[PDB]
Write a protein that binds this ligand. Structure first.
Ligand code: HEM
Ligand code: HEM
Ligand code: HEM
Ligand code: HEM
Length: 211
């Protein structure tokens, strides 16, 4: 019983600093790349049509939106702006079930300092590991080292250009590709905890924008 996707809106309303930074990332602009005449040079190199409209192409949208083919996720028939672009749930997991726990646990902490185990969030679908999710978009090509690969494949592979080589441990540390990291008070605790969480929090910026 995995959880349904719902879109970025509620996440962004509670996490304004991360949302503001995420908006400037290539992930947030992913659907723009599928539009005609955008990234013409890159498309030519990959032997795609620079003038074609790929925004409703099922061979392309799944890696440029949230939750394609998944419950509550993006559909070409009724495409939600809040699921357009690679958004919050594409990395952190579909949020319909865990988002309410962020609200309740946040209120419990503000009122009484009570912390909540991350295990409770993982049970509700939140992802604290990320690698498989990033890989399903970035390493989904024929003969890829990632064994979950299956069509449709990304046209942007190491064969096309070495700049498309993907190494999770390196790229998850590119803030300009994730979003800047801001300091957490520590409402959630324990495992499963992302392997680089303490590192990211140790150099995180202070609560910038919102509250
Ligand atoms: C939308 C589904 C959504 C996402 C995505 C999201 C992510 C998120 C992360 C990654 C954390 C950190 C967890 C950890 O410590 O490992 C986090 C923490 C908090 N959130 Fe959140 N969050 C989403 C939605 C919401 C909503 C709608 C609210 C507000 C009602 C909210 C609140 C919080 C709070 C509070 C925390 C703890 C912050 C702290 O300082 O420790 N989130 N969220
Ligand atoms: C998982 C945490 C994850 C990582 C790590 C990751 C990295 C990453 C980088 C470094 C880029 C390049 C950014 C830039 O050049 O400015 C990038 C770009 C795209 N990604 Fe990604 N990405 C992660 C996760 C995901 C997921 C889950 C998907 C598919 C739903 C995905 C897709 C894309 C796409 C598409 C781009 C390009 C956007 C564009 O320019 O149109 N990524 N990612
Ligand atoms: C479908 C034919 C399709 C199109 C069209 C498309 C376009 C596209 C562009 C223009 C980019 C940016 C490349 C650049 O160098 O700036 C881009 C990037 C990524 N895509 Fe995409 N894409 C199409 C399909 C798919 C599919 C089916 C997947 C996932 C299986 C996918 C994934 C990605 C990823 C990952 C990137 C980022 C590459 C990087 O910069 O590292 N795309 N796409
Ligand atoms: C979508 C706009 C979005 C939100 C909202 C969001 C929130 C969020 C929080 C609150 C954290 C913890 C504090 C911090 O700033 O580090 C957090 C951490 C990570 N995120 Fe995130 N995040 C949003 C989008 C995305 C996207 C699209 C990706 C993947 C390309 C991504 C990845 C990460 C990673 C990795 C971390 C570190 C996790 C940790 O330290 O526990 N986020 N995000």
């Amino acid at each position: 019983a995995d959880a349904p996707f719902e879109g970025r809106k509620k996440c962004s309303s509670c996490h304004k600093a991360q949302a503001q930074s995420w908006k400037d990332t290539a992930h947030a602009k992913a659907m723009e790349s599928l539009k005609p005449n955008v990234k013409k040079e890159a498309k030519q190199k990959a032997k795609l049509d620079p003038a074609k409209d790929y925004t409703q192409d099922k061979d392309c949208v799944g890696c440029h939106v949230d939750g394609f083919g998944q419950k509550g996720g993006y559909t070409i028939e009724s495409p939600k702006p809040m699921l357009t672009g690679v958004g919050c749930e594409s990395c952190h997991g579909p949020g319909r079930n865990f988002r309410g726990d962020h609200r309740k646990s946040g209120q419990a902490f503000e009122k009484s300092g009570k912390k909540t185990p991350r295990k409770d969030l993982a049970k509700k679908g939140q992802d604290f590991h990320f690698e498989e999710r990033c890989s399903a978009c970035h390493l989904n090509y024929e003969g890829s080292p990632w064994k979950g690969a299956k069509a449709p494949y990304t046209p942007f592979t190491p064969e096309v250009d070495a700049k498309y080589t993907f190494k999770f441990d390196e790229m998850v540390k590119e803030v300009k590709a994730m979003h800047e990291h801001y300091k957490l008070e520590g409402v959630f605790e324990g495992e499963p905890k992302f392997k680089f969480h303490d590192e990211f929090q140790a150099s995180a910026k202070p609560a910038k924008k919102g509250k």
